[PDB]
Design a protein around this motif. Structure first.
Motif, PDB file in Angstrom:
ATOM      1  N   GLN B   7       0.822  -1.199   0.000  1.00  0.00           N
ATOM      2  CA  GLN B   7       0.000   0.000   0.000  1.00  0.00           C
ATOM      3  C   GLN B   7       0.862   1.258   0.000  1.00  0.00           C
ATOM      4  O   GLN B   7       0.705   2.108   0.872  1.00  0.00           O
ATOM      5  N   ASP B   8       1.761   1.360  -0.978  1.00  0.00           N
ATOM      6  CA  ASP B   8       2.684   2.490  -1.117  1.00  0.00           C
ATOM      7  C   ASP B   8       2.199   3.794  -0.485  1.00  0.00           C
ATOM      8  O   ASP B   8       1.027   4.156  -0.589  1.00  0.00           O
ATOM      9  N   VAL B   9       3.113   4.490   0.178  1.00  0.00           N
ATOM     10  CA  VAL B   9       2.792   5.760   0.812  1.00  0.00           C
ATOM     11  C   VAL B   9       4.030   6.644   0.809  1.00  0.00           C
ATOM     12  O   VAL B   9       4.782   6.681   1.780  1.00  0.00           O
ATOM     13  N   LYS B  10       4.240   7.344  -0.303  1.00  0.00           N
ATOM     14  CA  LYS B  10       5.383   8.234  -0.455  1.00  0.00           C
ATOM     15  C   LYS B  10       6.710   7.491  -0.317  1.00  0.00           C
ATOM     16  O   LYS B  10       7.774   8.067  -0.537  1.00  0.00           O
ATOM     17  N   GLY B  11       6.642   6.215   0.050  1.00  0.00           N
ATOM     18  CA  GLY B  11       7.846   5.407   0.213  1.00  0.00           C
ATOM     19  C   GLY B  11       8.372   4.975  -1.151  1.00  0.00           C
ATOM     20  O   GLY B  11       7.604   4.813  -2.099  1.00  0.00           O
ATOM     21  N   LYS B  12       9.684   4.784  -1.237  1.00  0.00           N
ATOM     22  CA  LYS B  12      10.320   4.369  -2.480  1.00  0.00           C
ATOM     23  C   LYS B  12       9.907   2.951  -2.856  1.00  0.00           C
ATOM     24  O   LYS B  12      10.737   2.145  -3.268  1.00  0.00           O
ATOM     25  N   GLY B  13       8.622   2.650  -2.707  1.00  0.00           N
ATOM     26  CA  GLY B  13       8.142   1.322  -3.031  1.00  0.00           C
ATOM     27  C   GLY B  13       6.633   1.212  -3.121  1.00  0.00           C
ATOM     28  O   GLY B  13       5.903   1.889  -2.398  1.00  0.00           O
ATOM     29  N   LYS B  14       6.170   0.353  -4.023  1.00  0.00           N
ATOM     30  CA  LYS B  14       4.745   0.123  -4.223  1.00  0.00           C
ATOM     31  C   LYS B  14       4.493  -1.370  -4.300  1.00  0.00           C
ATOM     32  O   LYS B  14       5.392  -2.141  -4.636  1.00  0.00           O
ATOM     33  N   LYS B  15       3.266  -1.776  -3.992  1.00  0.00           N
ATOM     34  CA  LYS B  15       2.911  -3.184  -4.028  1.00  0.00           C
ATOM     35  C   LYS B  15       3.857  -3.954  -3.111  1.00  0.00           C
ATOM     36  O   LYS B  15       3.933  -5.175  -3.171  1.00  0.00           O
ATOM     37  N   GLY B  16       4.585  -3.219  -2.276  1.00  0.00           N
ATOM     38  CA  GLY B  16       5.519  -3.840  -1.352  1.00  0.00           C
ATOM     39  C   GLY B  16       6.903  -4.041  -1.936  1.00  0.00           C
ATOM     40  O   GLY B  16       7.070  -4.777  -2.909  1.00  0.00           O
ATOM     41  N   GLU B  17       7.900  -3.387  -1.347  1.00  0.00           N
ATOM     42  CA  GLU B  17       9.276  -3.511  -1.815  1.00  0.00           C
ATOM     43  C   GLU B  17       9.850  -4.872  -1.436  1.00  0.00           C
ATOM     44  O   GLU B  17       9.723  -5.315  -0.294  1.00  0.00           O
ATOM     45  N   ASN B  20      15.899  -4.203  -0.194  1.00  0.00           N
ATOM     46  CA  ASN B  20      16.254  -3.335   0.926  1.00  0.00           C
ATOM     47  C   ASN B  20      15.327  -2.143   1.127  1.00  0.00           C
ATOM     48  O   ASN B  20      15.259  -1.241   0.292  1.00  0.00           O
ATOM     49  N   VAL B  21      14.610  -2.159   2.247  1.00  0.00           N
ATOM     50  CA  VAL B  21      13.683  -1.092   2.602  1.00  0.00           C
ATOM     51  C   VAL B  21      14.241  -0.397   3.836  1.00  0.00           C
ATOM     52  O   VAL B  21      15.352  -0.695   4.273  1.00  0.00           O
ATOM     53  N   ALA B  22      13.473   0.532   4.396  1.00  0.00           N
ATOM     54  CA  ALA B  22      13.914   1.247   5.586  1.00  0.00           C
ATOM     55  C   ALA B  22      13.727   0.328   6.790  1.00  0.00           C
ATOM     56  O   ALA B  22      12.986  -0.652   6.719  1.00  0.00           O
ATOM     57  N   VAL B  37       4.222  -5.359   7.295  1.00  0.00           N
ATOM     58  CA  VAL B  37       5.199  -5.684   6.262  1.00  0.00           C
ATOM     59  C   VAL B  37       6.072  -6.969   6.294  1.00  0.00           C
ATOM     60  O   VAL B  37       6.228  -7.614   5.252  1.00  0.00           O
ATOM     61  N   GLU B  38       6.606  -7.383   7.463  1.00  0.00           N
ATOM     62  CA  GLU B  38       7.444  -8.588   7.548  1.00  0.00           C
ATOM     63  C   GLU B  38       7.859  -9.310   6.259  1.00  0.00           C
ATOM     64  O   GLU B  38       7.246 -10.311   5.895  1.00  0.00           O
ATOM     65  N   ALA B  39       8.895  -8.825   5.589  1.00  0.00           N
ATOM     66  CA  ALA B  39       9.358  -9.482   4.370  1.00  0.00           C
ATOM     67  C   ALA B  39      10.139 -10.739   4.733  1.00  0.00           C
ATOM     68  O   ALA B  39      11.260 -10.948   4.265  1.00  0.00           O
ATOM     69  N   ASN B  40       9.531 -11.570   5.575  1.00  0.00           N
ATOM     70  CA  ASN B  40      10.135 -12.818   6.024  1.00  0.00           C
ATOM     71  C   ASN B  40       9.439 -14.029   5.407  1.00  0.00           C
ATOM     72  O   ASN B  40       8.233 -14.210   5.563  1.00  0.00           O
ATOM     73  N   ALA B  41      10.214 -14.855   4.713  1.00  0.00           N
ATOM     74  CA  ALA B  41       9.695 -16.048   4.049  1.00  0.00           C
ATOM     75  C   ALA B  41       8.176 -16.187   4.117  1.00  0.00           C
ATOM     76  O   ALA B  41       7.475 -15.885   3.153  1.00  0.00           O
ATOM     77  N   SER B  42       7.673 -16.643   5.259  1.00  0.00           N
ATOM     78  CA  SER B  42       6.240 -16.838   5.452  1.00  0.00           C
ATOM     79  C   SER B  42       5.426 -15.791   4.691  1.00  0.00           C
ATOM     80  O   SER B  42       4.854 -16.074   3.637  1.00  0.00           O
ATOM     81  N   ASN B  43       5.392 -14.576   5.229  1.00  0.00           N
ATOM     82  CA  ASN B  43       4.640 -13.475   4.636  1.00  0.00           C
ATOM     83  C   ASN B  43       4.968 -13.204   3.166  1.00  0.00           C
ATOM     84  O   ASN B  43       4.081 -12.842   2.391  1.00  0.00           O
ATOM     85  N   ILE B  44       6.231 -13.376   2.788  1.00  0.00           N
ATOM     86  CA  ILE B  44       6.656 -13.143   1.406  1.00  0.00           C
ATOM     87  C   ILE B  44       5.824 -13.959   0.424  1.00  0.00           C
ATOM     88  O   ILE B  44       4.932 -13.431  -0.244  1.00  0.00           O
TER      89      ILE B  44
END
Lengths: 58, 149
Positions: B7-17, B20-22, B37-44
RNA sequence: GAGCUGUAAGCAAGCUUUGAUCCGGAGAUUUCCGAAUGGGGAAACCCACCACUCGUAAUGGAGUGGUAUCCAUAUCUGAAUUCAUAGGAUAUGAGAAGGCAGACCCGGGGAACUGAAACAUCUAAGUACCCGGAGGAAGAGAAAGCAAAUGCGAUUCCCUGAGUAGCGGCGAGCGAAACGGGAUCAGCCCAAACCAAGAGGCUUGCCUCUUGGGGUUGUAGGACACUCUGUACGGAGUUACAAA
RNA sequence: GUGGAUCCUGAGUACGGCGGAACACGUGAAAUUCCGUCGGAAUCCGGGAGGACCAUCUCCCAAGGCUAAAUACUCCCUAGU
RNA sequence: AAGCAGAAGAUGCGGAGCCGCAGCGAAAGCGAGUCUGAAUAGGGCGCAUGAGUACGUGGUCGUAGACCCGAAACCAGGUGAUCUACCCAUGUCCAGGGUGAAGUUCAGGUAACACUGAAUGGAGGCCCGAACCCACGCACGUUGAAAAGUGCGGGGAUGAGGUGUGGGUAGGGGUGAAAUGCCAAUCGAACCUGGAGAUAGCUGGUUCUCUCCGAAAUAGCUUUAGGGCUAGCCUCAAGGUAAG
RNA sequence: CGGGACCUAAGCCGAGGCCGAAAGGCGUAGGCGAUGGACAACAGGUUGAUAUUCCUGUACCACCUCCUCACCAUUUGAGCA
RNA sequence: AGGCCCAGGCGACUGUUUAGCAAAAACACAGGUCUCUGCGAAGCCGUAAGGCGAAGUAUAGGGGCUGACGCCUGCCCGGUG
RNA sequence: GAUAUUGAAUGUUGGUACAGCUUGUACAGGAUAGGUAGGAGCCUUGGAAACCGGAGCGCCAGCUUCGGUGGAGGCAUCGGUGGGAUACUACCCUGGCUGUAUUGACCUUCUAACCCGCCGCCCUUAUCGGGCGGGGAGACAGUGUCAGGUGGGCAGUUUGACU
RNA sequence: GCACAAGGGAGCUUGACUGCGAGACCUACAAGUCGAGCAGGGACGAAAGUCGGGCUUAGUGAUCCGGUGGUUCCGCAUGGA
């Protein structure tokens, strides 16, 4: 004072200054009053700064 | 340094980066109430499905555009006379209806909102060209002809 | 199986060969203070409430039980708020609080005198002492173990190695370990892939919630697939070995 | 038991910096182990140990839980010395 | 040796170990030789010149209370403001006699005021002086009536006061109108229990007999000078021998 | 009569709770606690004793109705409060 | 149930101080001055929580110095804060 | 102080990664041409040499940038007294510059963590505590390590002997 | 103590040396002092010979800890460090 999420505890240590003597000094754990969830619904419980990163949602 | 906004919000990413994110920024704000967000296997992988699910939808949409293409070309000559008369002109109105509606002369139906012809069609009887324009992704071809009665 | 009524040996009145006095097992009663815990309290005391019972014309009063707190499992309610939650009410709880062998061993706190012919690194010491814990043993324990060839196959303790290897104002002092010889000698499971059952967020899909199977190894083992063999009359079991 | 085409074999962990303790070893050539504070790995072509460290080689699978007996000590009940 | 048997006894059985038998060099190593060194040179050491081992008795040296007596003081864990220092809360005590302020009133007096004189009034860490609180004189006391009092004087004595009752402040501390004072007849750091049988070059005391030999108070040094360690001097034993 | 079946002060204890290596420290609700507030019995006699307790007189407070009269009102509600 | 008159040093006074050797020329005080403190305080008692200051608010509190009152309180910021 | 708690932006600036252009100018070729793998080719009225100015570069020799004019051409390679060697195409670079791409310092401001001996409501009759809203504060503070200072204020000790 | 000069002047020059060292003095020890002579290679002098720093006797000190060179030594399994 102990956080629930993890077993961190205060542990006494020593100040090994130059020409170590050396003076005694206890070492408290880092903590935060930010809310955590136990039996519903918060609040309130202390949390270690290490556990606070990622992991359980506030 | 690894999350999935979506859900992009002015962040350097959309549809989920996925790269490397902040960090520490989400621990208390982004994740809570904001966009977990948790870009950890499971959620990914799970995001994958959606991205995954619409990889299936990608197929769907692309092929909607290109099923329907091909579906209407060999079409039997469109025999919808537009009241050809007036010492050599016509009476029938050639615009949007007869163009598209020329398909349910047997059954199938379409949407008048897909026609592709800048200029209005000169009220003739000749090989009325009809470049079916269903979607930008896919164009088609149709024809129209007028007869005397 | 003949005396007994404790010390206490002297005094009164009594019990017993239809068997006491005595010794033991199993019980009973077990006042009040005491973790105390109905409330308070200056320990050995006062003041109650809720039900039953006695008694009183009635009040007052007297006996029998319940009523501390926290925690756990439950059952109903219910604040800002609508749901809800906090909170409250009630029920079920040989739970927990305590005491002590001045002993032994684990964990967390922890010195100083002294020695160094002083004293500040060190010694005393992780000793005394405080607290938390336990158990009759605890801790440790079945290999990320030692070790250097024809290698040894869990820990613990004892004898050695040896006052050797080393550490150390390299001062003062501290002080191993492996191998070898003995005591006692049992080794297994939980997590994780996969199967089955129940649900539930969600876009069919799907990813975790729970309950049982599956399976616990290192010249790697298991899930998975493919072979047989079994579900017994065999093996094991209340001390690890799953629980009893 | 036969197979190794696909998946697992213990994550904020294992280690490293800083700051200490415990290992006979007093921070040095120094492990190893246990703490606090910050960084933070592979996952079988993998990982750890073999007293800094590296390669080789030799052994072992850590980050889960159980374990009687050999061992220590008596306030106490017996008997004996 | 532990250990397995064996009256918790000896004796067994177990060779794990230990020491000796020939060393040298720092080690590498070599070997009756080895090291230093270019050295078949020299020299150090070891050979050549060969006894230990395991117990028992004794002399003693080390590690432990280590030969008894003795510190002042340190640290840890507790106990006490029932005396006393102060605080808090609530009560209570202060015979009487003087001085006279503010204020007020009435007259004098001013345009109003100031001011003046009498009356009224009763304040004060006020005066005098008993209970009480003290503690400056002297004397008596000092194996005192008494571990601080008495006899005759003295100060304060309505207040910064005396005092009862209950409570609070705990020892690397409290409290202190402050002197190192007070905290249970103890205070430059209180009392008991533990580390402690602390230490100690300092002190005192080492309890039966005879026989033989028989010193020294010097030197070198020493955080030493009232200790200590070697040499000087003593004694015992075994050898050399007859060196003196 | 004094104290307790009344209250509260200093202070203390103190559910949940706030904190602290542990032990514990702090502090709400509440409770404890007189040196205070509230509260009804006074005169003579008596023993080898104890007497605003025993006794002879007169009393007082609080509570309870097998009772005796008087006044009222049945949710338009007498009264307890 | 007071012995007074004087003359000087020190201390304004009352008061307080070593209970148990020294009560004072000592201490303290009102006053004077400097400095710090804006409330969640400066100073503190405590590891902390809490509390004192304070049911305060720069005409209020903490600390140093000096001691009623009268005349006054000079110069120096190099050094040490 | 840094760091961890630990926010979002902007502003500046750094670091890099990228795209591109221009720059690299040694007797010599013929000069006062980065080289290298290709290439025997050129290019020129999709207006050439030439000049004229703008423009930058610089070995101020030259190179380049553009356009004005011009009006039909410039070459090299090659042969060459230089290490190469050029019509050039490819590549990648030397200097420089620009953007892009990301970050970390600054830079402000805000503001959802956090913070309130702030206000109301509820727990709850309760200045404790907590919910709950409101408000101010704010990425600090506070605390956590870690480091340097100040520090008798509190400790452990020394301060010789001969004489 | 030295003019048989060790005292002064010139030539050549670095023995201002490597391994040593029979034997003694000094005597608590640690340490200090001399040394003929052997060998390795040298300087001077034709040779003989002399030279292991100054006419002699003072001008300096442990151990521990680290620094710098020379090392057919060791280097926690094997190779290096």
């Amino acid at each position: 004072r102990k956080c629930v999420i993890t077993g961190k505890k205060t542990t006494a240590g020593n100040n090994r200054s130059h020409a170590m003597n050396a003076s005694k000094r206890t070492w408290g754990a880092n903590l935060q009053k930010v809310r955590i969830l136990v039996n519903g619904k918060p609040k309130k419980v202390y949390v270690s700064a290490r556990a606070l990163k990622s992991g359980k949602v506030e | 340094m690894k999350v999935i906004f979506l859900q992009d919000v002015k962040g350097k990413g959309k549809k989920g980066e996925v790269k490397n994110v902040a960090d520490g920024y989400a621990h208390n704000f982004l994740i809570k109430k904001g966009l977990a967000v948790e870009a950890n296997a499971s959620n990914i992988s799970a995001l994958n499905g959606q991205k995954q699910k619409e990889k299936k939808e990608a197929i769907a949409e692309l092929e909607q555009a290109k099923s329907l293409k091909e579906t209407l070309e060999k079409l039997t000559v469109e025999l919808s006379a537009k009241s050809g008369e007036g010492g050599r002109l016509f009476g029938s109105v050639t615009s949007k209806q007869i163009t598209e509606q020329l398909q349910k002369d047997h059954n199938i139906k379409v949407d008048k909102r897909k026609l592709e012809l800048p200029d209005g069609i000169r009220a003739l009887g000749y090989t009325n060209v009809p470049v079916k324009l269903h979607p930008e992704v896919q164009a088609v071809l149709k024809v129209h002809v007028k007869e005397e009665a």
